[PDB]
Ligand binder design. Structure first.
Ligand SMILES: Nc1ncnc2c1ncn2[C@@H]1O[C@H](COP(=O)(O)OP(=O)(O)NP(=O)(O)O)[C@@H](O)[C@H]1O
Ligand SMILES: [Mn+2]
Ligand SMILES: [Mn+2]
Ligand SMILES: [Mn+2]
Lengths: 230, 235
């Protein structure tokens, strides 16, 4: 992913153009997301292939369980910017709703339709964007996945619909909210040894002091549109 | 007022020009100005000639000649004339027959009120129109073979919140659908609407109120009292 981002930016510069991986640079148009497909394997065999929902295995359902349960905390690593929350807005275009489904591109976790191939059986976590550190985002999603199989988190029932909506758990609406969810739920990362409690604390502190707090201080131009006359 | 009272008015006040106004078929006011001596008692019956073939939806070139018959009750001073000018609203007479012209909208209007009185249902119909308008600072339109365009502009226009203005951009541009009816500096048309309201009052119009309308970029409305059919369409 780091190479991917490097060549794209540098070929753009070569042709006198400029690239951004920011989630929402354009208002009233599609955001830039980083959908991340994942699957566990042992002895060359796909472990997410089975006879349960959407041709998945119970382990695969459990991995989704963890992802969905730890998703608000996961967002402090997978969507770590204030701008991330301009894309993760209810309506345009989702995935704001914490549920799994097959084929449904409005759900947080999507099970793509594989051509009856066990090797192509995986989950698509749609929430992430390309502002994330792929090393941190991937390690975090793995940890939530493993905890899901080990605990053995029921992901609930699939939601095979477009757009009552309060019955379904939702993702954080801001960066501080995702940082709050990380303080409350970080044992699936730390207790493992992968992320140190030192790192998890410095992450929250860096994001609050350098992004959340500087943003709260700055007047937004749309505040003139709404408030100049008052 | 009577034909003689209007003629006495012109003599006493030394009014040199008379502006006779009349509507065309689509709805546009037409006019012709005359030196005072051209208007006599007979102008109020026989009427004053003009070309009925240059007015949209009327006579054909071969049967052109028509007559303008002014209404004495409409006489007032037109404030828009530097030279003190008396203005009257006309109805159109057919010189061939001597009867009121069947395509004259003002004749049709009188006929409608005559019909109401004929049925015994009522003697009077009161009409109260409420005509909203836009007050623009600029208008550019056209359409050629390779183009079609219109560009409407106003200082109140919300589309102008980020523009450089001469000394400078003072804000308070009403938002779309948000013009009814915040105070000044949002409403920039208070003084003008009062002037529009007061000058038409002096023209003989029964006036009531005025306000800024819903739309951003100059939508306005002036409120006038009801009147009888012809009087209301004259108003
Ligand atoms: N009995 C009546 N017959 C005919 N017209 C009337 C009558 N009474 C009032 N009007 C007129 O109808 C017009 C209505 O203005 P207004 O009093 O503001 O009513 P309105 O419905 O609140 N106006 P608006 O809010 O823009 O729809 C005025 O010209 C009144 O004089
Ligand atoms: Mn995708
Ligand atoms: Mn109105
Ligand atoms: Mn009104």
């Amino acid at each position: 992913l780091m190479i991917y981002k490097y060549v794209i930016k540098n070929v753009a510069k070569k042709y006198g153009k400029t690239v951004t991986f920011m989630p929402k640079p354009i208002f009233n148009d599609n955001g830039s997301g980083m959908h991340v497909h994942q699957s566990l394997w042992k002895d060359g065999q796909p472990l997410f292939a089975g006879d349960k929902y959407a041709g998945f295995s119970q382990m695969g359902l459990w991995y989704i369980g963890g992802i969905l349960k730890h998703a608000p905390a996961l967002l402090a690593f997978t969507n770590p910017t204030t701008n991330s929350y301009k894309r993760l807005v209810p309506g345009f275009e989702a995935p704001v709703n914490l549920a799994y489904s097959q084929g449904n591109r409005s759900a947080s976790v999507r099970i793509p339709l594989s051509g009856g191939n066990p090797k192509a059986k995986r989950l698509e976590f749609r929430c992430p964007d390309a502002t994330s550190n792929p090393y941190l985002a991937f390690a975090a999603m793995l940890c939530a996945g493993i905890d899901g199989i080990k605990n053995q988190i029921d992901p609930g029932e699939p939601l095979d619909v477009d757009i009552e909506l309060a019955k379904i758990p939702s993702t954080p609406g801001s960066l501080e909210a995702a940082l709050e969810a990380l303080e409350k739920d970080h044992e699936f990362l730390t207790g493992t040894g992968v992320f140190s409690p030192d790192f998890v604390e410095s992450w929250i502190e860096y994001k609050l002091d350098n992004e959340v707090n500087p943003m709260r201080l700055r007047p937004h131009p749309y505040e003139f549109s709404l408030y100049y006359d008052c | 007022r009577t034909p003689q009272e209007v003629l006495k008015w012109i003599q006493d006040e030394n009014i040199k020009i008379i502006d006779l106004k009349f509507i065309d078929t689509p709805g546009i006011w037409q006019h012709c100005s005359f030196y005072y001596d051209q208007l006599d008692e007979n102008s109020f019956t026989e009427g004053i000639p003009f070309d009925g073939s240059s007015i949209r939806g009327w006579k054909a070139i071969n049967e052109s000649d028509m007559c303008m018959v002014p209404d004495p009750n409409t006489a007032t001073i037109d404030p828009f004339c530097k030279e003190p000018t008396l203005s009257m609203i006309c109805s159109i007479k057919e010189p061939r027959t001597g009867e009121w012209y069947n395509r004259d909208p003002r004749t049709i209007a009188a006929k409608a009120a005559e019909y109401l009185r004929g049925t015994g249902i009522a003697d009077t119909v009161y009409f109260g129109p409420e005509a909203e308008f836009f007050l623009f600072d600029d208008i550019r339109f056209g359409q050629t073979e390779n183009s079609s365009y219109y560009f409407a502009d106003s200082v109140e226009g919300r589309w102008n919140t980020g523009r450089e203005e001469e000394g400078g951009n003072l804000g308070y541009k009403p938002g779309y659908k948000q013009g009814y009816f915040p105070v000044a500096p949002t409403d920039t048309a208070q003084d003008i609407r009062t002037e529009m309201l007061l000058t038409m009052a002096a023209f003989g119009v029964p006036i009531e109120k005025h306000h800024h309308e819903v739309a951003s970029g100059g939508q306005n409305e002036l409120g006038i009292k009801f009147d009888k059919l012809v009087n209301s369409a004259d108003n």
